[PDB]
Amino acid sequence: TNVTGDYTDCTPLLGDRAALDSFYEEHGYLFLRNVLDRDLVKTVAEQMREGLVALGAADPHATLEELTIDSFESVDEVAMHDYVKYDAFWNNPSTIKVFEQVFGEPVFVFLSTTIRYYPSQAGSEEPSFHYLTPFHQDGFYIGPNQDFRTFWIPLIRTTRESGGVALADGSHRRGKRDHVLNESFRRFGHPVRGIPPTEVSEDEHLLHSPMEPGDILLFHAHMCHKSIPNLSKDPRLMRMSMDTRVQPAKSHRGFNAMTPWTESAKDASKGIMAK
Ligand SMILES: C[C@H]1CC[C@@H]2C(C(=O)O)=C[C@H]3CC(C)(C)C[C@]213
Ligand SMILES: O=C(O)CCC(=O)C(=O)O
Ligand SMILES: [Fe+3]
Ligand SMILES: [Mg+2]
Ligand SMILES: [Mg+2]
């Protein structure tokens, strides 16, 4: 793996505004352990599971960690957005309290959330990983304001093998980087764009650590990050997660902030190619 390090546990920095902001400024992310209500997170995992039983031919008697699906692509993603009640989760007072502590002011949560339910493909000779993400910055496609932050949460635990999101430590300090067409990552049967290896720095150490439901990983608009594929074997786990963006309540609310995933993903996926 190109991963060379773990996320730093930033939870004890929450009590110190100056130290929290200092870490975030240098590194471009915060990793917070067990700050969300784990029981609330479980209910969202359960919602996703029931969607997968209805739409992905998942075992109706499997536990969350026993669950699998034959194919991410066979699942109607639009219909999954009716099952997973993410807005109710993000806007729960317990969740909002955490967001407000991070920003130090009232927040607005994007009306778009991406939901991810990725089965293990350990052993597959022709794995389907084209639905993952290349190295990119969320600020490449979200704007015009660049003061939102991405909030990424596991719905069930991740392992180093089941994957998640890898962060290039401190890669958010030189603005937007070039994103170029990459045939190996696709949405709606067309390539998307990612940051090429020539815009990657060896100094921006790649980080990924296992996370538990209740944890949050959040990062700057210019943080360069990529998906880690699910090659889990023991245990063989689904990688179940969701990501939204959050910004100060006073900041401009752009297209991405105001438009649900079902009404924007297709158009945005085409739109980025003209950027
Ligand atoms: C920039 C690329 C990779 C990351 C984003 C992404 C994702 O799944 O996070 C899929 C592509 C389509 C998009 C318009 C939402 C922008 C994406
Ligand atoms: O979880 C992934 O595979 C990618 C996540 C991502 O790009 C994001 O949260 O902005
Ligand atoms: Fe992203
Ligand atoms: Mg059985
Ligand atoms: Mg800058």
- CB atoms inside a 10 Å sphere around CB 214: 19
Whether the CB-CB separation of 29 and 220 falls below 8 Å is answered with yes
Give the environment of ion ligand 5: residues with CB less than 5 A.
175
Q: Give the SS3 label for residue 253.
A: coil
Whether the CB-CB separation of 15 and 216 falls below 8 Å is answered with no
Phi, psi of 254 (to 5 degrees): -85, -170
Q: How many domains does the chain have?
A: 1
Domain containing 210 equals 1-275
Resolution of the experimental structure, in angstroms: 1.4
- Residue type present at position 212: E
Give me the CATH number covering residue 214. 2.60.120.620
**By what technique were these coordinates determined?**
X-ray
Binding residue ranges: 116, 136-138, 152, 187, 225, 227, 239
Gyration radius of the chain over CA positions:
18
CA 149, CA 223: separation in Å to the nearest integer?
A: 9
Residue of 90, 148, 150 best suited for mutating to test ligand 2, as the one with most atoms within 8 Å of CB: 150
CA 135, CA 174: separation in Å to the nearest integer?
A: 15
Whether the CB-CB separation of 243 and 151 falls below 8 Å is answered with yes
